[PDB]
Amino acid sequence: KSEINIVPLLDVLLVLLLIFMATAPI
Amino acid sequence: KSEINIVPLLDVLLVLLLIFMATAP
Amino acid sequence: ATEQNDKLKRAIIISAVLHVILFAALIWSSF
Amino acid sequence: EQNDKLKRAIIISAVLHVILFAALIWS
Amino acid sequence: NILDLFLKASLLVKLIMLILIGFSIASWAIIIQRTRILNAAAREAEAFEDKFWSGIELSRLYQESQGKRDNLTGSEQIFYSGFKEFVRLHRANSHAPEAVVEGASRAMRISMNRELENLETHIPFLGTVGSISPYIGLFGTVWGIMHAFIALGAVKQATLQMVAPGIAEALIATAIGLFAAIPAVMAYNRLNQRVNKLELNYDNFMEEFTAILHRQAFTVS
Amino acid sequence: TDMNILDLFLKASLLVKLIMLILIGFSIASWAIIIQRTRILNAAAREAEAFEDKFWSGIELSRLYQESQGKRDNLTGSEQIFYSGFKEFVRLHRANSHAPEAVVEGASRAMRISMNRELENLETHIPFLGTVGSISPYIGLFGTVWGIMHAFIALGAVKQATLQMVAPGIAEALIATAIGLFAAIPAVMAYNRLNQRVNKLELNYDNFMEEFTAILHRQAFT
Amino acid sequence: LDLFLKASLLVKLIMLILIGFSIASWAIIIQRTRILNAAAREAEAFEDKFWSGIELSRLYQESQGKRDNLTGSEQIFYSGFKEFVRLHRANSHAPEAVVEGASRAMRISMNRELENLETHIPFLGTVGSISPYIGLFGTVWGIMHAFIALGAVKQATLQMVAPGIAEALIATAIGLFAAIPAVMAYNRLNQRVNKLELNYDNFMEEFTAILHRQAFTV
Amino acid sequence: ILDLFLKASLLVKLIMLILIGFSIASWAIIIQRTRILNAAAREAEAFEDKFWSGIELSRLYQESQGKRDNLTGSEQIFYSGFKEFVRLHRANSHAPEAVVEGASRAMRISMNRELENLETHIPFLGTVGSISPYIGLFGTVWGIMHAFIALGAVKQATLQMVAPGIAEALIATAIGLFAAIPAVMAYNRLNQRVNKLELNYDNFMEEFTAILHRQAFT
Amino acid sequence: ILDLFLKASLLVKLIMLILIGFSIASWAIIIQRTRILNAAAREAEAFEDKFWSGIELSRLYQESQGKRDNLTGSEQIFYSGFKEFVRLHRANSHAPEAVVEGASRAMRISMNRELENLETHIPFLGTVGSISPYIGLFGTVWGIMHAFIALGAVKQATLQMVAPGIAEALIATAIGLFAAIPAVMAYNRLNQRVNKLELNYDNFMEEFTAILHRQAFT
């Protein structure tokens, strides 16, 4: 019937992690 | 019915994210 | 008939008390 | 019969994973 | 502590707290009130159903329920309107028994739909809170992160250390958005299963009752 | 807020610029539908409540049929359910050769469609809100991911690029998710409320359907 | 495109399967939409033509005159009338057995219609629910190649971590693009089928009721 | 473990005790239900053999009286049906056309009573398997607040003051997963055992009803 | 790539073997069931083409007799219903329904044990698709803890020394999803094929019961 749609919450964290990770060599 | 529950990954990501806070110069 | 609204007001009041107790315990546990 | 058929299915899918895991390190 | 940072967190995070606390307050009031109601209805259903199935005469069981005609519930209300229109249509001339039992079965059907609609009233709101609460939390964190990267884009010498609290006060809006969603979504599923089980009880009772009325009517021929 | 009111998506790549248009459009379309359907469902509820009173007032049903014929092009809701039922009933009953009861069955289907056609006219733009309230978050995320991939590619020739020369580009990519969620919260919240209003109108019309078919089945014999 | 030419083999496979599921989802959306429009229109056209007051046996005779590709509300009526009239030829039956023999045929034929509308809806719901997690697995694979590069040299270059980031980030982009078609359409199409089932179920009550009056009088 | 739990903040005390207290409760429920669901299946086949031995249902009902106080599973369906059948067709001889639906109710209520006695704690495993990971996330979010408050106290951050906040988050996630694995593995395994044992007990719904309909009408 | 498996802590390599074990078992079950449901569906189609040839059931029955060791699916439920019908129609038969209610019972006791002769290993996939990401995440979280246990003894830390440990830890989530995705897709796909096949057998046995009531009653 219904569930928490976790994917948008997870994908914003993935994007923020990828931004920091691409910033680590700078 | 059965599906894939991923919720504890949010935590792994919160931890991995904080390592970059702990290491930025 | 209408008494389900009185029961709903009772439910709102006890829900509000339970949240105030929860956040009071949470803020105390920050110490 | 069926215990030998599931054994053959385990064998053929196991070698399919072995060649996939080889292809994964090959490139 | 948390509270001496929270009092100086951005106005947007203040609003996102008052919104999410409001839905957490409201959803728990529904969970309490709609579980008590369903506990009462599921008990009043079976506690009438045996009384009816005792083998006592249906006519006197109907007549004794007239003393509380304004206060009936669930299976007893479903029985009462079905029997009332049955005895009226059977007392009336010029109606064949297949039309008499139809009229009773329909006056039962519409009363049973009105009992279930009166039973589930606030449940759709839990479907709302479980659906928007994660997205309200996510808008809270995305606005916080975006405003942190704007502030980080202003300084001559950038580092993550100067926006760390801006990221932290963003990220917890995800967490409280999610913790206000969990009770609502798990209880929306659970309460719908309880309504469907109680609907199947009324549907079964409506078949068992219309079966005895069908035989009772055609036996007069 | 806290940024230049005169500068926006305008300078960004054509795809995040396009995603910005479809998402803000949605929000405008969503709010236009909320206002249009809220006005219509208020009017329909008021007209149904007024008609159940006028019908139970006890004035004889040929007066209702003759006056409703006097405004047959503008009938709505319970008055249009009544009209289609009584129209078919008098037409069919007129053929006295009919089966006394079978007249009631035929009239009831006449109203059943009229109800579905009125109830569909109440619903028209509601499934668009269920669409905006479910794709808009993901369209926001996809716009943001394209923005991020385009922020790093714009410096991919230089490694010396300081975080200070990509942080504004990252912030401008998060806007697509912020708009994408801002279009979603009103849409899915209003979609649940409006669907529920429509079910209340359905149950009110089904109440009227039983009330009418009862007095009709009586009048068919006594 | 050179940025994809040297991508890791695991990401090649993830792109082919997710683009495949996106293309297959759009093909299902348009295919099921034309079918459900046609079936909803045929039901509305037939049930009017039937309820018009035309004689059931004449309607049945011209419906047999089109028994080739009869699928729809026509086929549902035909199945119910055929076992009604055929079972009626044996005058030994009580009328309850005649309305049984009609409703026995048409309930079977209704399920045979619904299973022809339903065909690719549960595949689309499978894709829409698992597709962002295929994207997520591709993202975690790219995150590993990024951390391996950050573990290589004392001060890693942006150029050597970027392949892991680009693979990780594209796997999330395509994981979203291969989920938009299924998340809008699956609930819409499943609701459409439920509405069209309720239409045939209303035809079950209405048609068996007139046959019940027929059986109790002929 | 205890090296860090001895110095964890007060909210972690509660979160750890709750989340390990679900694990313990979950394992206790698996032990209790895996006795019952296995003894209530054995006592079904150990009724069916006796039933199909050719002994009279009169003798079955008579030899059942001496253990009615503890009667459970399939024979408690049978006894309830036969008790009410005797009370409506043999203790009073009236209306043999009307006892069959009485016997159908008398098995229906006994069925729901027996299945409720099997299910007693199965829904709780369904909540533990759903909620245990979110209690882990709450432990994580609190551990991450203990990280950021320790980070804000220094001009330049390093892992040295961050490590106890990270260690807290990870151990709360690990315990949340350790409580969830048994719960969601066993919940499906037990919920299929109940559905199987229900469809086994449903082997009366036509069989017993037809036998007592024959005994009423003969 | 085995280099990490050759050196990593006992728990993460044990978790690696569990997840590869579920992945092997899952793919073996997917290919197996698919071949079994393909056979069972084609055997149902071949029996429908026989049944609708207009062959008399009393001689069609004789055909199965030739294969009493290899009866299956639709032809097994036909044979079991009809081998009871001949008996209930021979000697004492009670009502025409009493001979077609006992025959239909003798079908449904072979609906079960044809279902549950197929549908055997599907609920295993239902568990693998549920726990496999949690097992991958538990291996991952233990991997982060093992890295920090080695790291925290040093006076300073950097990505260059912790990132290899995190990269080898994230493999457990990657394999955890790679074992889960085939299971969740194939569980939903195969479970829908079983429900389609159950609907087909129920449509057959009800529609056969109409021909059986025609031949019993007239």
Residue numbers in the entry:
A (entry chain Y): 13 to 38
B (entry chain Z): 13 to 37
C (entry chain G): 4 to 34
D (entry chain F): 6 to 32
E (entry chain E): 5 to 225
F (entry chain A): 2 to 223
G (entry chain B): 7 to 224
H (entry chain D), I (entry chain C): 6 to 223
Cite, word for word, the article reporting this structure:
Both systems rely on the proton gradient at the inner membrane to produce force and movement that are transmitted to target proteins associated with the outer membrane.
Further refinement yielded a 3.2 Å resolution 3D density and a second structure of the TolATEVQR complex, named TolATEVQR-II was built. Comparison of the two structures shows significant displacement of the cytoplasmic regions of TolQ chains A, B and C, whereas the structures of the transmembrane and periplasmic regions are virtually identical. This region has two conserved proline residues, Pro138 and Pro187, that introduce a kink in their respective α−6 and α−7 helices. Prolines are known to form kinks in TM helices and to be involved in signal transduction. These two prolines may modulate the widening of the hydrophobic pore that would not only loosen the restraints on the ExbD/TolR TM dimer, allowing it to rotate, but could also participate in the gating of the proton channel.
